[PDB]
């Protein structure tokens, strides 16, 4: 089949910028391409078909160009309502076809380092036989952040999960939660629990830690 | 034009489920009609199409298991699913297709969850304000909403009177097949010990309501 890639995967832009994102196809598909917009929790919206035809109802600041293997969607000036994910699609007779991975457009603001908080597991949870340690990275920009768990100054992998919020509507930052999950037995086998945070807002990694008890 | 979907919900692997899409403002007999799904956090997939004169075609991931059909007299589209798999968990959309999979009109989506887990209310644990969650006049506190199924859960704080500084994070699916999420709020350190902070957790699928006071 045909594979589609999009660039960039992430774009940070301001209201009023001209924005150009790109779709490219593993092989010629020559005008069989559409562009859609999707916002979190809604169906996608068709923007452009036949690589260049604007879909009826779609504002004119949107335009598409290209053919063969390389295609481009442009927003000549960006509005608030435009921050969203954008997908390209190869049109096909039969239902497989292809969607690109998407390009997410978020709101540019100044760099802000995370505010970092750590939470030991509750006595109630420990009574259940499980320990969750929670690290919170609050109100940071840009969205890329690295979280490293360390137990007794030693590095963990595979025992944590991460969740990130959508960009905040008031201050345009992100927040991130990391949960380290251990058996009760493992948890009390060890003393120092630490969350080490790396983010372009920080001049060096910052570590928050507690001693069990 | 309007497309209203129904029939999604929780179903066990190996089970069957039938979706409906009730169409207004145009006649499904005279169109290409399509189902398109979207797994949580992932991209779109066109899985089925029914042509004007009743020819049907399927993506190979659903071929042999899913069946697209319509009732002209009811003006409704249907997706019959059999032998469901965990990977079939997704929001399912019906769409008017202008041919070649060009989707100009979309339903609102219906969530289909394919899992072995039983419906289960969450345990709610405090994320207590401490010295390691206080810096300056700001303190972080929250609730860990652990091991529920299925989505969704709602969390408010102080029955909705407290909304500034709240972050309720998207749930993660754990290896267990159960969901966990945290909800945090940042508040004046001055307020601790005199202001009460309760997280109100509501898990409608298990009829579970929890009110957890969180304190230092």
Author numbering:
A (entry chain L): 1 to 95, 95A, 96 to 212
B (entry chain H): 2 to 82, 82A, 82B, 82C, 83 to 100, 100A, 101 to 113, 121 to 220
What does the paper say about this structure?
The heavy-chain sequences of these two antibodies only differ by four amino acids in CDR H3, namely VH residues 96, 98, 99, and 100. Of note, COV107-23 uses IGHJ4, which is seldom observed among clonotype 1 antibodies but highly preferred in clonotype 2 antibodies, to encode the two amino acids at the C-terminus of its CDR H3. Both COV107-23 and COVD21-C8 bind strongly to the SARS-CoV-2 RBD, with dissociation constants (KD) of 1 nM and 4 nM, respectively. In particular, we focused on three IGHV3-53/3-66 RBD antibodies that have a CDR H3 length of 9 amino acids—one in clonotype 1 (COV107-23), and two in clonotype 2 (COVD21-C8 and CC12.3). Our biolayer interferometry (BLI) experiments showed that the Y58F mutation dramatically improved the affinity of the three antibodies (COV107-23, COVD21-C8, and CC12.3) by ~10-fold to ~1000-fold.
Antibodies to the receptor binding domain (RBD) on the spike protein are frequently encoded by IGHV3-53/3-66 with a short complementarity-determining region (CDR) H3. IGHV3-53/3-66 antibodies carry germline-encoded features that are critical for RBD binding—an NY motif in CDR H1 and an SGGS motif in CDR H233,49,56. Distinct sequence motifs on CDR H3 are present in the two public clonotypes that seem to be related to differential light chain pairing.
